[PDB]
Amino acid sequence: MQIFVKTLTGKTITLEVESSDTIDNVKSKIQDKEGIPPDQQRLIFAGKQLEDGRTLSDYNIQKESTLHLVL
């Protein structure tokens, strides 16, 4: 499934993920597209900061969900 990660510049990152993907795994996928170090990414969804050792399912991030990125 694809999900969108909006940055504050306005650009939107599209990612191909699974619900079983860990947040750390997603951040690594971001590094793979943008070059951003994972240990400098803070991901938000549903007014919550995403925890590295948790997964997408732990927040109910489904297809067409959009997250926010803080640098």
Q: Which residues bind another protein (CB under 8 A)?
A: 20, 46, 54-55, 57-60
Can you list the alpha helix ranges (DSSP code H) found in 20-63? 23-34
Compare residues 33 and 42 and give the one whose CB is closer to another protein.
42
Strand partners, 49: 44
Three-state DSSP at 5 gives strand
Cβ proximity to another protein: between 5 and 50 the closer is: 50
How far is the C-alpha of 8 from the C-alpha of 6, rounded, in Å?
A: 7
| Minimum CB distance to another protein smaller for 33 or for 54 | 54
Task: Quote the least distance from Cβ 16 to another protein, whole Å.
Answer: 20
